[PDB]
């Protein structure tokens, strides 16, 4: 899925066994110094082995402090150590970077002229959020405007809304499914769907990511051989994928993939978290561009931090599922509801996106997050470096393989004034090491101009152009 | 379940061996002397070895002509060679022996005055049988009026009745249960049992012979597992049973049976072919003995042959049973008739063994069965002998494990003017022959000790006293 120059899964595996042996060592003389209030350790002694011996080498590419909106240009403080590396510590100089690590696909997240006066005057009507869950007290009016909005926009019956993405999957999954089920998950999932599988007690198989030929021998197999000790039927199956495989930057194969799901009569559990304002012609998710009826996906998934501007989660589906967790969703029962003008924030979003606003600029923001995406993608590969994903995706991320690369394409980047943001082993596979870029909808033409010219330089020097160029 | 001298269990082996290396010997120089129209032959070489070489030694103990009513006394044909034993040829010469190798227990098959005036009347009025089958001109008055009577007997709501015996099993099995059904069957059951479970296509498993401990751990296991290689569910269960165990003599361990038949839900199939008449206090069987409510047990077959002299079966069960088969049963569609003077002779009996003929002698016979069959089974174990069976049951077989003493006992018993039967290899397991000793309600006390005289001095001389006197 990955092509891999040999020559250089050869030197990273070396460079990885090189900072194990001196890891190692090193640990093994802070041991016998130990030796100069009765409770067991916070953390044993080689838990957080990689924690230690690898992140803190490399700690100031992570964490960096801002002090402007998540904008275009941004302000980066400046961090010293003042202990020998082990604490930093911000100054009061700043720098002026061009963001390209945050996700305001579409450039809401700023001060613009008809979302925030709406917002500011819905605050000082609603002071904050209600102390409250949406079951007693929390279901302002505003709460109910916006579950009318999401419904009008995603397509399905009826939404509910939650105030954290992270928790719209492990207080749902449990209720869906529980003992004696089946989860077929991709292997390429969040944190959020795995961990929220596990809440439940439901079972968990892994196919192959985004190959559907693989997704059908497992349900084969699965549905032949019953529970896995006494072979009884299984209660349920149900199919997790997501729209846009974020850090593979892959458009997902949803129309072969319900079309394998009705013949065996399982379950579609759709992830659209990184592709509901950015991919589509009206911005109407992976459902909309890739031509497939929204009726065929049982649950819909999304969130609004990546596109709108504002945190929040979203579930939609058939009238009685949404009447379902209304009635018996924790998220729904025990937590406080999301804030008012981080909800006015949607819901004026949503009305510039569908042009309700009176102006047009709804569809500019639309056709200039694909001409940049197209832009900046065709110009990175032209000059030999490895980009993943598709045409239509606004994540690119290039492929670095080796661990000593990845402080020195970022530091390199941040003192030419540009920000970038990578990802090392201990959260990816140990040969896959990466820098993911983001494009919006608020870059000008002479910023991605400026900014390739700063890529390229930075990329002759760590060697990463493994293709070549013409 | 049964014990065996261990020094007899090693001169059986071996006289079985000899016969098999003579044999083997013989067949090889007759194989080579076929040297002196073009089909395949209608018996292979060998696949009947024992028919010819071990069968043919002794066929002058079996098929054995009488020219006599069924009686306690009857005539037995001389037979001769004439061409060196290949072919015995019957004379005119008879003999005057005791029968004690037929089966008549309650001395119906017989002259007897209240049984035989009314078959005849009721033969010159109706013919031999009818030419049609039961659902078209073959159910007379008289088929109507016995099937009532069977009812009122045997105590279930509806009975239906066959014209044999042994399609009284191969024909019905395949209708109440299919393919993917189970059937635990009895170690010990008829032949006419095991075909009818072949004709469906439902699978045999085999619970050890009269042992509940056993027929739980099999049920246990077989409803754990599922079916053998998809483990789908097991869409029925059914257990064969019998009441009294022919050539073991023993009585079922019904209530046993019936108790872990209903905690698993399987279905109790009971089989009275050998006690429908004979145990009892009021010859109503083994559900009447043993005390156990009759309505535990589903299916309830029986055989006339045996107690009321005259051929038959039946099935007696649930009123949906009946009328279920008396649409789906193709014995009882295609087959025609049971013949009328063969059922009149039915009615006629029952109605002597439930008093219902103005005499009382319908309990002279049901005690006479029994004080002759506790005297008979008493005197053997006394003179040393092995007999089988409980004390309440007109079977007893004596073990004489030794091939060579099948033509011992049974030509020096006839030579002396008694007949007994004796049973070889092929049909039981290589180590147990036995003989087969019937008591009947016609025998006499001057009969029982004149006929037990002789057979203590034939067990002398073949050394049958396996267990010691007094």
Redesign the interface.
């Known amino acids: 899925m990955i092509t891999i120059p040999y020559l250089t899964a050869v030197s990273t595996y070396f460079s990885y066994g090189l900072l194990f042996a001196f890891g190692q060592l090193r640990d093994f003389f802070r041991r016998f110094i130990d030796w100069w209030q009765g409770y067991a350790p916070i953390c044993l002694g080689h838990e957080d082995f990689y924690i230690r011996r690898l992140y803190h080498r490399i700690q100031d590419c992570f964490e960096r402090p801002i002090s402007s909106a998540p904008d275009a240009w941004f302000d980066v403080v400046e961090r010293y150590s003042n202990d020998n590396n082990k604490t930093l510590k911000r100054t009061t100089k700043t720098s002026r970077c061009l963001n390209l690590g945050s996700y305001n696909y579409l450039g809401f997240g700023s001060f613009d002229e008809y979302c925030t006066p709406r917002v500011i005057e819905s605050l000082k009507k609603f002071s904050a959020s209600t102390c409250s869950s949406r079951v007693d007290a929390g279901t302002t009016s505003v709460h109910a405007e916006l579950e009318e909005c999401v419904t009008r926009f995603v397509g399905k019956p009826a939404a509910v809304v939650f105030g954290m993405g992270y928790a719209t999957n492990s207080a749902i999954i449990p209720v869906l499914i529980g003992k004696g089920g089946l989860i077929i998950s991709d292997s390429l999932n969040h944190s959020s769907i795995v961990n929220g599988a596990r809440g439940s007690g439901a079972t968990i198989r892994v196919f192959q990511h985004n190959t559907p030929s693989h997704l059908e021998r497992v349900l084969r197999e699965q549905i ?1 051989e ?1 529970q896995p000790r ?2 009884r039927p299984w209660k349920k199956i149900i199919v997790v994928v997501e729209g846009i495989y974020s850090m593979e930057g892959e458009i997902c194969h949803l129309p072969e993939v319900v079309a394998i799901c009705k013949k065996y009569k399982a379950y579609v559990y759709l992830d659209e978290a990184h592709s509901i304002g950015a991919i589509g012609k009206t911005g109407k998710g992976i459902c909309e561009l890739l031509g497939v009826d929204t009726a065929d996906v049982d649950v819909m998934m999304g969130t609004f931090t990546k596109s709108f501007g504002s945190c929040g989660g979203y579930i939609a589906g058939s009238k009685e599922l949404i009447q379902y967790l209304k009635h018996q969703c924790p998220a729904h029962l025990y937590a406080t509801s999301i804030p008012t003008p981080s909800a006015q924030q949607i819901i004026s979003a949503i009305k510039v996106i569908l042009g309700e606003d009176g102006s047009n600029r709804g569809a500019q923001k639309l056709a200039r997050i694909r001409e940049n995406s197209n832009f900046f993608r065709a110009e990175l590969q032209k000059m030999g470096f490895e980009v993943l994903g598709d045409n239509d995706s606004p994540v690119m991320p290039i492929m670095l393989y080796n661990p000593a690369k990845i402080p020195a394409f970022s530091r390199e980047c941040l003192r030419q004034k540009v920000a970038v943001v990578v990802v090392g082993f201990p959260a990816t596979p140990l040969l896959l090491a990466r820098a993911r870029i983001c494009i919006s909808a608020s870059h000008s033409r002479e910023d991605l101009i400026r900014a390739l010219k700063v890529i390229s330089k930075v990329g002759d020097l760590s060697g990463i152009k493994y293709f070549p160029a013409e």
Do not use: C, L, P, Q
Request: hydrophobic share 25%; charged share 0%; aromatic share 0%.
């Open positions: 032949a019953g006494t072979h």
